[PDB]
Amino acid sequence: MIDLIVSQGRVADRAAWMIEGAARTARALEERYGLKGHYVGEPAPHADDDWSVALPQARETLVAVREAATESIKGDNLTVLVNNTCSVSLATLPVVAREHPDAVVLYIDGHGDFNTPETTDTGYLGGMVLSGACGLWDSGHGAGLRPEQAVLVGSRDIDEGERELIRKAGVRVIPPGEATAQAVLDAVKDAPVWIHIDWDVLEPGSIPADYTVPDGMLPAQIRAVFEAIPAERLIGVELAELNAPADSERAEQAVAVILDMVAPAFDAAAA
Numbered sequence: 001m002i003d004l005i006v007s008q009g010r011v012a013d014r015a016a017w018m019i020e021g022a023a024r025t026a027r028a029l030e031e032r033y034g035l036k037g038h039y040v041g042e043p044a045p046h047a048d049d050d051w052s053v054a055l056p057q058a059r060e061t062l063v064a065v066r067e068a069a070t071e072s073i074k075g076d077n078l079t080v081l082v083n084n085t086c087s088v089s090l091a092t093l094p095v096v097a098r099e100h101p102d103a104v105v106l107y108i109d110g111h112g113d114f115n116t117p118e119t120t121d122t123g124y125l126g127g128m129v130l131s132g133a134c135g136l137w138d139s140g141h142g143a144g145l146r147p148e149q150a151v152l153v154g155s156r157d158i159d160e161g162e163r164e165l166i167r168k169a170g171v172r173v174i175p176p177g178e179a180t181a182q183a184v185l186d187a188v189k190d191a192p193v194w195i196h197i198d199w200d201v202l203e204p205g206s207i208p209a210d211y212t213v214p215d216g217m218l219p220a221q222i223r224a225v226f227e228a229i230p231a232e233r234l235i236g237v238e239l240a241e242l243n244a245p246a247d248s249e250r251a252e253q254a255v256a257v258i259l260d261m262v263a264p265a266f267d268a269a270a271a
């Protein structure tokens, strides 16, 4: 079955509606699969604070997400986190790597999220998530994820400094035009799999752009990844960074696309 965990506490959010987007996504999953989410954390307004300020502010939410994710990973169900920001994964990825040292993390994101305190241009915690989990810097919530076990999927237009940190650490990158289901399966080999998704990986707007080559990943490419990962091997899935206001038509349309992408994996786990 499925364990649904929903972050609703601020974790460095610089966007206005990602807590609301997480809630609406969770609601759609509850209605479709007959689930009741475990909601963690208290909302707070977005702000452009430095990671050194935002990170301590988020400690209570991160600790609570860590303990909820730990219980789920140790059990028998599919762990599904609907997270406001990628930074929630500073708490979950060290758990994944500890409980499943052989897991491959598919970090599906238009960005690398591999900055350190020394290299970040913007101070944003969300751009430091994968490097933190891999121990390039100390988030205060552990590390232990081998960069050799992390695969960035859909990332593009990466700052050349950050791209060299990624390369030196051994993180593989599969850009959108290479990110077929088979390309992703070849990267995973026989490993159990954790999927982390930042929706900015998706090609914006124009749903049937039939005569142009997309720069981002298409919804069909994400679905093909969820179709291809065997249910027995899937440890869990994180859905992050839907920026859409509560009760907006936009949020209703967005979660319908999300449910279509994740259905192969979630339908199988619910059986």
Ligand SMILES: [Mg+2]
Binding pocket: 072, 073, 075, 076, 077, 078, 079, 234, 235, 236
């Ligand atoms: Mg499980």
Ligand SMILES: [Mn+2]
Binding pocket: 086, 109, 111, 113, 126, 198, 241
């Ligand atoms: Mn991200």
Ligand SMILES: [Mn+2]
Binding pocket: 109, 110, 111, 198, 200, 201
């Ligand atoms: Mn991103």
